[PDB]
Amino acid sequence: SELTEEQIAEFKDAFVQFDKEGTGKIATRELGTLMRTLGQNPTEAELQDLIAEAENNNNGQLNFTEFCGIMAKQMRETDTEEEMREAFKIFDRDGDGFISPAELRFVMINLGEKVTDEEIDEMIREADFDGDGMINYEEFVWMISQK
Numbered sequence: 366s367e368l369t370e371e372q373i374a375e376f377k378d379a380f381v382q383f384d385k386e387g388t389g390k391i392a393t394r395e396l397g398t399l400m401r402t403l404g405q406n407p408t409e410a411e412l413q414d415l416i417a418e419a420e421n422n423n424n425g426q427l428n429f430t431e432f433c434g435i436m437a438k439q440m441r442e443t444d445t446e447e448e449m450r451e452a453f454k455i456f457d458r459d460g461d462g463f464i465s466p467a468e469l470r471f472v473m474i475n476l477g478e479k480v481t482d483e484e485i486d487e488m489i490r491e492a493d494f495d496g497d498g499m500i501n502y503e504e505f506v507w508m509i510s511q512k
């Protein structure tokens with residue numbers, strides 16, 4: 366839950382335990398497994414982001430700063446993902462599971478970000494892949510990450 370003396374030594378140990386290449390780094394294909402043996406638990410997409418980016422660049426290796434970096438984020442709370450899902454619910458005045466330009470227009474005002482039905486309507490289309498003019502926790506995570 367924090368980078369405390371013991372905690373640091375905890376994952377730092379589990380870090381050198383997976384050191385294959387020996388370049389002071391561990392293969393990305395081991396990070397997830399490292400997050401399993403540890404109280405860590407990111408999002409499928411996240412672990413895929415690193416493995417995919419590092420997939421073909423440096424045999425997929427990680428540094429103490431790389432792992433501890435993500436651990437720093439998760440430790441800060443749990444995953445920081447719940448914060449976005451929460452805003453999604455807010456932006457969703459209905460319980461249907463999707464958001465409409467109208468709802469989006471009402472909430473943004475609640476927060477304090479005065480927006481025009483046009484600017485946000487566009488942000489919805491850019492996030493709407495399936496094609497329904499509505500936003501789901503998935504389409505939401507995408508557009509919000511653009512902030």
Ligand SMILES: [Ca+2]
Nearest residue numbers: 457459463464
């Ligand atoms: Ca709705």
Ligand SMILES: [Ca+2]
Nearest residue numbers: 493497499500
């Ligand atoms: Ca949609």
